[PDB]
Amino acid sequence: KDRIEIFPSRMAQTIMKARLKGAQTGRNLLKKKSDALTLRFRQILKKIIETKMLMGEVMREAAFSLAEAKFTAGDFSTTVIQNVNKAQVKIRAKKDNVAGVTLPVFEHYHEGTDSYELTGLARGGEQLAKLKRNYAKAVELLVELASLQTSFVTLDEAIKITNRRVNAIEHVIIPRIERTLAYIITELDEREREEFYRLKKIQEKKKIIKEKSE
Amino acid sequence: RGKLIAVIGDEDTVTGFLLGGIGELNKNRHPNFLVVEKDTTINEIEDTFRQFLNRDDIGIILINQYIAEMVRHALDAHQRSIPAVLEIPSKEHPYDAAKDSILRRAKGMF
Amino acid sequence: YYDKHFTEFVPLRTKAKEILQEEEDLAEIVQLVGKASLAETDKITLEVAKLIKDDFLQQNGYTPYDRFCPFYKTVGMLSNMISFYDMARRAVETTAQSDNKITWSIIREHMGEILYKLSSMKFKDPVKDGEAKIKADYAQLLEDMQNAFRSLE
Amino acid sequence: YYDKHFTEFVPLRTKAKEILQEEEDLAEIVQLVGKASLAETDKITLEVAKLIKDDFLQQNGYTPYDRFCPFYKTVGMLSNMISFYDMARRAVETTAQSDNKITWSIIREHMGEILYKLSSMKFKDPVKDGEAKIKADYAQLLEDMQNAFRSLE
Amino acid sequence: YYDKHFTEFVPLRTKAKEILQEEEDLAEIVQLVGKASLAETDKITLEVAKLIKDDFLQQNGYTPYDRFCPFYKTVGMLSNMISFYDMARRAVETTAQSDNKITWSIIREHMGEILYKLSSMKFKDPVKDGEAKIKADYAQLLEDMQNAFRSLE
Amino acid sequence: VCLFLNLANDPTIERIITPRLALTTAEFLAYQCEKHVLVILTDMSSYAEALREVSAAREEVPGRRGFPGYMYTDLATIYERAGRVEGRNGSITQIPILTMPNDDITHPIPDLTGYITEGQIYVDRQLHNRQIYPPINVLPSLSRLMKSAIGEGMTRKDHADVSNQLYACYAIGKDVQAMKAVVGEEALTSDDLLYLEFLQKFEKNFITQGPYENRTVYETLDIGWQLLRIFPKEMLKRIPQSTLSEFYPR
């Protein structure tokens, strides 16, 4: 509660002082972990905002390219949506050891299975081909973008856990060690005093005996 | 092999990505995508979104912003990392910026 | 002595000590964790332990109702508090692996009237309301709990 | 005395003390971060220091093999363990920032039997076994380690 | 004493402590924000508190002009710095409603010469520039200062 | 050298006059014969123990932690018989050497000494276990008179500047080393790596010396610069540009 409740002793002083040094060292090392996570978090934040901005422009261009494909082809969306079987793009999970914390990152995997070739409506193949490329690039950006968000909220959780532990060391564990140590120091001086009293009285009693002998 | 990307969006958005080479059928003939039409209700969108969250094969989910507002409670309720959800501007709805889940997840960003 | 006159008192005494000790064992770590890693079975212990602490262990000796606490009242209201613990702990233990887990927030909102009634058990004034009314009152709280649990689980 | 008779002990003694003290400092952080981030050299120091703590500085004095370990044997044992350390440290630092990066995991898998032999040196059993053989046996361990690292690099 | 001889000293030292204390109180907000999500009125406090810390509370005794600061100079310097503070707070607050507002960046860029003149006040050597001249220069600074703010409204 | 040896098995009262005889000689040599005397008093903790024995012989009631209540004035009586005097060219310095019981600087022996001395050298244990000799830790040490000891006309112009920069670089190197243990080698930037290079070479070249290598003040400073030239000029924030332009190159 308020004290570790170790009986006052010189041994307790040594243990408590070593315990305090350990707690202070842990506090400083965890504070550095938090600072490293906070810098990385903010960096991820800078890239994610700029990436989010870029995503806007890239998706706009892809959406426009679709308009051109539709202009030429007419209604290709019906065939594309219905005639779906296997993917050409797949995402493999990878681990990135950014710091003590390990974060999940996505990695783009070009599986290789061929996409559908469609020249059925007005044979608008070139516009569909440019459209494939524009969205293909869009997906690659988005994959990167998820590795931002998927590696980001995990940093916010890691920071909250680290800071909570650091705060407890600072607000709970060390104050408690310092109160215990100060308690020990005071009680040991109290024991020193009662020894002083008895020794002083012993010296006076010896003096009285000596006077009686004269 | 590892993970697929699920897409929930309007006709043009889904069509674009499918041409992008992303999206496929599962072994149970289920599709990892939904086309959201004007006649599609909230329960159907949410049921699809959740089922992707409960599927171990998906992971990144791509949605339109306007949809994110339609079923917004389902985007904040689940906090993990599999379901990395990216919100993209629809053909006509304008550039996203506000009400981004991640932008909220950090309150220190302009 | 207790077996001769009461019987129910001793297992209630044991369960009460286990709840209070378990809460202390948790409080040591909760101060550091922030109630983030607690299981639903542990949150029940923590809040029932509060119920015991605030309503059972403390009493205002300068009131007409807490100036004297006849033994039959102490064991009576303790039985209800422990009965709640066992029923609330069962409610989550039988549902945690199902398709809907009865978390503390669900039982807390569903049975808020029971938690208030349990806290009111101190305000019985044994001089004005004698043993017969107090025992009948506590029996009603037990029935109210059982009926609310049947509607919950 | 040591320089007259052995010539090897003084520098082995210095390196052994460096390893044990470095281990204590690395232990302080490992207990905190769980080895999430360590330099490859630091990983070797921790693992060789465990080899030393368990298979050099620890002995059962009621066994025929460790009732008394003659100094020539003590030096033999330490010479091999440090020789391993230097070769393991050289290999990972020499191949660092290149293509065929060598790590501890690669060394342990490549020459796992070398660590077993090093951990077995306490069992050569002096007096029952001869001085000439024990020296020859430790010489063989050194030759095997040198060939094991040569083939790894 | 202060009322009889200087009159304005007492409210000035009160405001000075408030500005300096607020700079400390804002320290946590600045550390976690970087002066981005920060009120323009707080930016005035931070930068003016710096001015106070730099060109008032700091004193360089190895310079012939700063060996001794007469009281009338100490209150002169503080009066003009706080008078600036008050004008800067009003410039932002009275225009902060909508459409066309004043910010600290606008004030600092707009009247950079005035902020410099405030810092320059410590160089008024009492040995060569008499009481009337230094007070006159400080009075002119106040007028130049208030007029610079006037152009912003 | 004038050497006084009071052995552990010698009379304990003789241990009390031993430093008084050494200082009496130092005062004669220094102040009457116009020369500079360095006085080294080794194991003042053993002196303090002999003083406690004398107190018991007088049947005095022990003071704080068993030591005499006059331990303060007794240590001052020894220590303060040193320094320069007006009108004479002699001087006495002292380097008392004290063992800290239980390695606690709070103990009355180092506490009462430090309270009446000017700074401390401070020998550590970690540096010793790492087989560094001498094992002297520069971070917790202090010499309050260094400001007057060094500088043009006494050692070299750049002495004060080299010391301050080396202290900052060592403190930072230790701080970066602590960070490395948390974030790893790949998470460090170029400046951090330079501080780690300094830290390793500082201890190997500057602190590690050996018992038979005598490094004069000018060679020590030159070694300092060799370590400081690890960093580009702009990182040496505590050295004025005039000093850098004179000493930094070459």
Swiss-Prot record, chain B:
Record keyword Ion transport present: yes
One biological process term in Gene Ontology: synaptic vesicle lumen acidification
Predominant location category: membrane
Any GO MF annotation of the entry: proton-transporting ATPase activity, rotational mechanism
Record keywords, A-Z: Cytoplasmic vesicle, Hydrogen ion transport, Ion transport, Membrane, Synapse, Transport
Function noted in UniProt: Subunit of the V1 complex of vacuolar(H+)-ATPase (V-ATPase), a multisubunit enzyme composed of a peripheral complex (V1) that hydrolyzes ATP and a membrane integral complex (V0) that translocates protons. V-ATPase is responsible for acidifying and maintaining the pH of intracellular compartments and in some cell types, is targeted to the plasma membrane, where it is responsible for acidifying the extracellular environment.
UniProt protein name: V-type proton ATPase subunit F
Originating gene: Atp6v1f
Curated annotation (Swiss-Prot), chain F:
Signal peptide stretch: none
Localization (cell): Apical cell membrane; Melanosome; Cytoplasm; Cytoplasmic vesicle, Secretory vesicle, Synaptic vesicle membrane
Taxonomy, superkingdom: Eukaryota
Residues at which ATP binds: 144
Intrachain S-S bonds: none
Tissues showing expression: Expressed in brain (at protein level).
Function noted in UniProt: Non-catalytic subunit of the V1 complex of vacuolar(H+)-ATPase (V-ATPase), a multisubunit enzyme composed of a peripheral complex (V1) that hydrolyzes ATP and a membrane integral complex (V0) that translocates protons. V-ATPase is responsible for acidifying and maintaining the pH of intracellular compartments and in some cell types, is targeted to the plasma membrane, where it is responsible for acidifying the extracellular environment.
Similarity annotation: Belongs to the ATPase alpha/beta chains family.
Subunit structure, as described in the record: V-ATPase is a heteromultimeric enzyme made up of two complexes: the ATP-hydrolytic V1 complex and the proton translocation V0 complex. The V1 complex consists of three catalytic AB heterodimers that form a heterohexamer, three peripheral stalks each consisting of EG heterodimers, one central rotor including subunits D and F, and the regulatory subunits C and H. The proton translocation complex V0 consists of the proton transport subunit a, a ring of proteolipid subunits c9c'', rotary subunit d, subunits e and f, and the accessory subunits ATP6AP1/Ac45 and ATP6AP2/PRR.
Full protein name: V-type proton ATPase subunit B, brain isoform
Native source organism of the sequence: Rattus norvegicus (Rat)
Parent-record interval covered: 257 to 506 of 511
